[PDB]
Amino acid sequence: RIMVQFLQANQESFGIMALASAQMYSSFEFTCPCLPDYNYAYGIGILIVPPIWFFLLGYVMNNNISVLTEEWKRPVGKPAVLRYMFSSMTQRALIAPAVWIAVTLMDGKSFLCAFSPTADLSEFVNESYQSLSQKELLKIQAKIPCKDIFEEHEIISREAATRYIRCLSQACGWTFLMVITLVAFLVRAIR
Amino acid sequence: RIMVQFLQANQESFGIMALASAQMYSSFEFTCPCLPDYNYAYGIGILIVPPIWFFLLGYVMNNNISVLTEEWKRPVGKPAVLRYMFSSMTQRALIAPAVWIAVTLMDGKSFLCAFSPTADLSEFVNESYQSLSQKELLKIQAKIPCKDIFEEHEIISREAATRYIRCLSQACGWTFLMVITLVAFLVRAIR
Amino acid sequence: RIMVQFLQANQESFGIMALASAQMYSSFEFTCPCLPDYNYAYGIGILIVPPIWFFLLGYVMNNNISVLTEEWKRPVGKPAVLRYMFSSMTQRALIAPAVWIAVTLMDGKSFLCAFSPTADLSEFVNESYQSLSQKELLKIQAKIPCKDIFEEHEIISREAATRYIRCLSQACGWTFLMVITLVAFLVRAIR
Amino acid sequence: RIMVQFLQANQESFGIMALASAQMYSSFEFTCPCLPDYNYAYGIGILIVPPIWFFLLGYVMNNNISVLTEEWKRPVGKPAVLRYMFSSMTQRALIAPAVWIAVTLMDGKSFLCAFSPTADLSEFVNESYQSLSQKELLKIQAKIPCKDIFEEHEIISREAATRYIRCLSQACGWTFLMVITLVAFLVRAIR
Amino acid sequence: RIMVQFLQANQESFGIMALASAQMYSSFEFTCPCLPDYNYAYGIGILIVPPIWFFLLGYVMNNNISVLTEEWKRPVGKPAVLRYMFSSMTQRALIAPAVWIAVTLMDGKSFLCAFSPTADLSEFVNESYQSLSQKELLKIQAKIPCKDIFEEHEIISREAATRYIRCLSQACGWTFLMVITLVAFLVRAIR
Amino acid sequence: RIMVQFLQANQESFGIMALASAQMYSSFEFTCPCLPDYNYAYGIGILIVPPIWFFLLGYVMNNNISVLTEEWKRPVGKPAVLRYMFSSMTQRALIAPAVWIAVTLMDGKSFLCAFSPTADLSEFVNESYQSLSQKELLKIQAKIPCKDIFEEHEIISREAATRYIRCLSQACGWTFLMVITLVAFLVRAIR
Amino acid sequence: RIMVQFLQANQESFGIMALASAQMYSSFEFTCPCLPDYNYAYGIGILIVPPIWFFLLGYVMNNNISVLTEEWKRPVGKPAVLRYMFSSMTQRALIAPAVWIAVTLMDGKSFLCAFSPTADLSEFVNESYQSLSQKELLKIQAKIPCKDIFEEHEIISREAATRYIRCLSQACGWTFLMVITLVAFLVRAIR
Amino acid sequence: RIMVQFLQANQESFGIMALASAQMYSSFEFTCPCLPDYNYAYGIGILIVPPIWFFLLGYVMNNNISVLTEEWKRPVGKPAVLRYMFSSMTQRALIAPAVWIAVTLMDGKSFLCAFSPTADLSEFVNESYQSLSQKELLKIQAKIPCKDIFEEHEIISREAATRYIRCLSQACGWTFLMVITLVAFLVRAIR
Ligand SMILES: *[C@@H]1O[C@H](CO)[C@@H](O)[C@H](O)[C@H]1NC(C)=O
Ligand SMILES: *[C@@H]1O[C@H](CO)[C@@H](O)[C@H](O)[C@H]1NC(C)=O
Ligand SMILES: *[C@@H]1O[C@H](CO)[C@@H](O)[C@H](O)[C@H]1NC(C)=O
Ligand SMILES: *[C@@H]1O[C@H](CO)[C@@H](O)[C@H](O)[C@H]1NC(C)=O
Ligand SMILES: *[C@@H]1O[C@H](CO)[C@@H](O)[C@H](O)[C@H]1NC(C)=O
Ligand SMILES: *[C@@H]1O[C@H](CO)[C@@H](O)[C@H](O)[C@H]1NC(C)=O
Ligand SMILES: *[C@@H]1O[C@H](CO)[C@@H](O)[C@H](O)[C@H]1NC(C)=O
Ligand SMILES: *[C@@H]1O[C@H](CO)[C@@H](O)[C@H](O)[C@H]1NC(C)=O
Secondary structure, three states: OHHHHHHHHHHHHOOOHHHHHHHHHHOOOOOOOOOOOOHHHHHHHHHHHHHHHHHHHHHHOOOOHHHHHHHHHOOOOOOHHHHHHHHHHHHHHOHHHHHHHHHHHHOOHHHHHHHOOOOOOOOOEOOOOOOOOHHHHHHHHHOOOOOOOOOOOOOEOHHHHHHHHHHHHHHHHHHHHHHHHHHHHHHHHHO | OHHHHHHHHHHHHOOOHHHHHHHHHHOOOOOOOOOOOOHHHHHHHHHHHHHHHHHHHHHHOOOOHHHHHHHHHOOOOOOHHHHHHHHHHHHHHOHHHHHHHHHHHHOOHHHHHHHOOOOOOOOOEOOOOOOOOHHHHHHHHHOOOOOOOOOOOOOEOHHHHHHHHHHHHHHHHHHHHHHHHHHHHHHHHHO | OHHHHHHHHHHHHOOOHHHHHHHHHHOOOOOOOOOOOOHHHHHHHHHHHHHHHHHHHHHHOOOOHHHHHHHHHOOOOOOHHHHHHHHHHHHHHOHHHHHHHHHHHHOOHHHHHHHOOOOOOOOOEOOOOOOOOHHHHHHHHHOOOOOOOOOOOOOEOHHHHHHHHHHHHHHHHHHHHHHHHHHHHHHHHHO | OHHHHHHHHHHHHOOOHHHHHHHHHHOOOOOOOOOOOOHHHHHHHHHHHHHHHHHHHHHHOOOOHHHHHHHHHOOOOOOHHHHHHHHHHHHHHOHHHHHHHHHHHHOOHHHHHHHOOOOOOOOOEOOOOOOOOHHHHHHHHHOOOOOOOOOOOOOEOHHHHHHHHHHHHHHHHHHHHHHHHHHHHHHHHHO | OHHHHHHHHHHHHOOOHHHHHHHHHHOOOOOOOOOOOOHHHHHHHHHHHHHHHHHHHHHHOOOOHHHHHHHHHOOOOOOHHHHHHHHHHHHHHOHHHHHHHHHHHHOOHHHHHHHOOOOOOOOOEOOOOOOOOHHHHHHHHHOOOOOOOOOOOOOEOHHHHHHHHHHHHHHHHHHHHHHHHHHHHHHHHHO | OHHHHHHHHHHHHOOOHHHHHHHHHHOOOOOOOOOOOOHHHHHHHHHHHHHHHHHHHHHHOOOOHHHHHHHHHOOOOOOHHHHHHHHHHHHHHOHHHHHHHHHHHHOOHHHHHHHOOOOOOOOOEOOOOOOOOHHHHHHHHHOOOOOOOOOOOOOEOHHHHHHHHHHHHHHHHHHHHHHHHHHHHHHHHHO | OHHHHHHHHHHHHOOOHHHHHHHHHHOOOOOOOOOOOOHHHHHHHHHHHHHHHHHHHHHHOOOOHHHHHHHHHOOOOOOHHHHHHHHHHHHHHOHHHHHHHHHHHHOOHHHHHHHOOOOOOOOOEOOOOOOOOHHHHHHHHHOOOOOOOOOOOOOEOHHHHHHHHHHHHHHHHHHHHHHHHHHHHHHHHHO | OHHHHHHHHHHHHOOOHHHHHHHHHHOOOOOOOOOOOOHHHHHHHHHHHHHHHHHHHHHHOOOOHHHHHHHHHOOOOOOHHHHHHHHHHHHHHOHHHHHHHHHHHHOOHHHHHHHOOOOOOOOOEOOOOOOOOHHHHHHHHHOOOOOOOOOOOOOEOHHHHHHHHHHHHHHHHHHHHHHHHHHHHHHHHHO
């Protein structure tokens, strides 16, 4: 509900592809497969491929890609403005992927789905079953991001590990935001 | 509720047939027949025939199809602009079917209805009835997309297979979106 | 709730009689009599007579029917434009009945009320009472479209047959829409 | 709730007395007396006298009734336009009563209150008390339109007869609408 | 809730004192004292004195009462227009009391509070206590319009008599409306 | 909820201090102390001192009180207009106190808090404890306006006396309104 | 909810710092520490320091404090207007603190938190524990303003003392308002 | 809910980065890890790094940082206005971090997460386990800010310590606000 709330707040306060990516995330049914084999793949895919598609889309929506390919295709184009126009296009296009990554990291769903089956959750596993094959722990830990599937509360506290992984995800998200802001500052200060 | 939410978000942010197809999907009562004989037919039909109707409709709503058929009908028309006008009409018309397919794939209802009776769900079938005729499994698996009909929780976990098939559907949807975006990029870069 | 939702969406997106028929359907209390003698009559009547009334109404609301009857009544009218004006009036009037039929077919209430008592529901009738007089089955099947009246769950699963008949109705509705769109395409391409 | 919904839809789509009558019906507390002596009187009265009052009101709100009575009162008026003006006034006034009758017939409350005590409900009366004095059946059937008063479910199924009478009322309403539309068509085509 | 609904509908459709009286009734906490001595007084008072106050208020809000009293006070006023102005003022002022009376009669609260203790409710009194002093019946019948006070369901059915008295009140209200409309028609047709 | 409803209705229909006093009452947390010593004081205070403060405030908000005190302070002011200006100021200021008193009387909270401990409630006191010291009745009757404190239902029916006192309060309120309207009529008719 | 209601009413009716202070109070999470040592400190602090901060803020937001300090700093400023400008600034700034104090006194939360542990609540303490060390009563009375902490209903009725202290707070608030209004009247009448 | 309420109130009343930080806090899912090792780190991080990022962002969004770095980079710039422009930029940028810190201190979530495991809560620890190793108390106290994890109500009252720490946080927040306002007053009065 917080994501939809901030969506409405951004709409009220309101370059546009940022809101598009935010809305698409807030209205995308993230469903972790909750299986030890496809958890990592699904999480990393949701993290990686939507920003790639947003990058391509931002390139396509640009009204002057045709002139770029026309000049790049000719031997002697009717040239410097070309590099500048291409850099401007790339910079305008890179906004939506960054917004998507930041949003999906602050909301640690992809991180929880991806890193649950293999993470080291030893402070959460009950003291009784503290000696059992990690292959048995694989399925149980993989079922963690699923509320309606995880029916083994006697072995692992679900919320206790959920909060831990979500905090790690939020830390990674803030680190990403800081690095991106530093790079943007350097770019705006040099070029 | 997510589909209606994104519908309202698209309305707020707001060529028009895209919103028409999105609204028609969000307000269409998808009812899987939940029978081993008509599941596949119904799913594939909901996937296939609505985009065909949208294609035809987009052709009909075009204001200058009459001039196209008039020129194609004459031996010597009062011609090149004809191919260009036809290509432009087709490109404008192809938008709504793609939006419909993308929406109905991201929301894996048609996929779940179509591929449930014949898919290989062996990790979900209970260990007790792990040796029984696939003809008996046919009806049970066909009843999966129906919440109020599937009353055999002792044989197959419904949600566990629902998430699996829905994840496969979302993967197919993202693949479709990527391919369509690549084709659109090539088209806008060449012609 | 889906019908009212699409009504509001159409109002937001917004020749006018289409919305009138949609609203009138979404606000009409369809009550199947749930009797073996009047089910068919009521269903077919709700399917047939409202579009006839809409046709007549669309003819009446037309501002230039008076000139049409004046010219048709005279021996030598002060004539060709007459056939064209009449065809245009008929084409404008035929919109609301088609919208009504499409809506009431996509929402398989009339179909369920009409075809329930005589349809062949043998895969749904319980295995115990699989040998009983069809005259006894008549009343039970007729009571199917009534949630608060059908109190014989031990003989027929209500939802299982409801979904089946509703799917058949939706198939018929899509077929009707496709045929109508093809005819409209031919008309706009020829005349 | 359907009546209020269509009221709001009519307000959104929006000679005016039609909406006035619709609103007055949707906000009028219809209370059937549920007594064998006053049921018929109350139902027929709600059906008959409100349209008469609407007719009189529409005559009163007309701004040029004074000139009509002035000319009708004089021996030689300062005359043909008189008949035309009177006919136009009557036609404008006759709209609200028709709307009231149509609405109160489509919503079979008046019909249910009026015809319940004397109708022949023999397929609904339980098989046990299938032989008892019609004088005893009078009170029971009269109590049918009252949900909070009818406490004799062991003798007559309330909903089963309610649906039957309401279907009859809706049939009568559609017949009335068709006849009125035919008359309006003839009037607009002749005069 | 119906009164507030029609209040909002009147506000949307929207000489002004009519809406004022309607709003004041819909927001006035009618509390029947439910005592055999003050029931009649309270009901008749709520019926009678608010329209008197509305009449006086409508006279006061009139901007030209000062000139009326100035001319009526002088021996030879600087006269015919006086009678006309006074009649116009009275006619404009008489609107709000009529609206108040009509509203409070259609909503049979005042009638129920006033006429419950002395009315003849013999078909509703239980057959067991069908022979008891009317002085004992006085308190019980007086407690009828109070839902949270009437705790003698074994002697009189509350809803059965409530509907009866409310129907009588609605009949009286419709009679009042018809008489008022006839008088208004005669006035507008003569003067 | 009725007070807030009429507040919103007044806002929609919309000299201004009247709405200010109405809003302040509808948003003021009236808390009767429910003690035999402070009940009367609190009720009469809520009835009396807020209108005094409103009177003073209306005098202060007046933009030309400075000229009034300047002229009243001088021996020979640069005089008749003074009496008229002062009377106009007083008449404009007297509106809000009257509105406050009328509102707080129609909503018999202050009356109930003030007159409960000493009123004669003998028809409501149970027949068992019909002979006990009035000093014991003092606390019980004082606790009447408190729903969550009055825990002696076996001695006095709370709602039965609440309705009685509230009806008396509403009678007093209507009397006050009538007297005020008569005085206003006389003032507007003389001066 | 009453505070937010009056906030919305003030916003609808709508020098500005008054609404700012009202909003800040209605959206400030008042949490009494419910300890015998910090109750008084917290209550008096919430009563005292926010108006001081509002005073300072109103001084800072003033656009011409710089000229004031510039002239006060110079030996011979390029002087009388200085005293007038300073008085006007102070008078404009003193509004928000008064509004804050009035609001937080009418809503007797600070008073209840501050004066509960040491007040004399002897009519509320149960008759059984009417003889016990005031040191034991200290903690119990301090826990009074906390609904979820006060678990000693057998010793003191919580609501009975809450209403008493809240009534005292409202009396103090009305006294403050009257004194402030009198001072404002004198100021506007003299200077 | 109070934070969102004040967000909406600020939006209605409505340099812009203040609302941005407020919205971002009200829509940020604060999740305390509830572990004795990461509690302090997470709390202090949420308190410290978001204002740093807001500072950097406010520097980046400034349209004339490029001219600043251009002049600072040159040996002899085409200089005094430089220091003034830089000071103005820094002052404009310092607003959002202060708003973030004030908001997150008034809402004592970060303080509660950070200082719970090591604070001295001896008046809240039950009298039975008043003698146990502080290492055992570490985990229990760390679990305090988690409602769904703290399942040791027999050792420490959760709400009693929550209110205490939240009150300390609010005191610190008000102190911070006072110091910031004093510094702003001095700055606006000197420079
Ligand atoms: C740990 O397991 C034991 C039994 O093996 C059970 O009683 C206990 O509740 C479990 N505790 C947790 C925290 O899982
Ligand atoms: C599997 O079947 C057994 C009995 O055949 C039943 O007790 C158990 O609950 C079932 N488990 C699942 C996951 O279906
Ligand atoms: C079929 O009938 C038997 C008894 O005749 C009953 O126990 C069973 O539940 C019924 N099943 C269905 C699906 O109607
Ligand atoms: C009919 O009456 C019998 C007893 O007389 C009762 O058991 C049965 O439920 C009733 N059925 C209906 C449909 O009223
Ligand atoms: C009538 O009274 C009898 C006992 O006197 C009671 O059993 C019955 O329920 C009552 N019926 C009504 C309708 O009050
Ligand atoms: C009156 O008191 C008796 C016992 O003293 C009790 O049983 C009865 O319910 C009470 N009635 C009322 C109306 O208080
Ligand atoms: C007073 O205390 C007694 C026992 O000490 C208890 O039974 C009673 O309910 C208490 N009453 C109040 C009002 O606290
Ligand atoms: C303190 O502990 C005892 C048992 O050790 C328990 O009965 C009591 O409820 C506890 N009280 C609190 C306030 O934790």
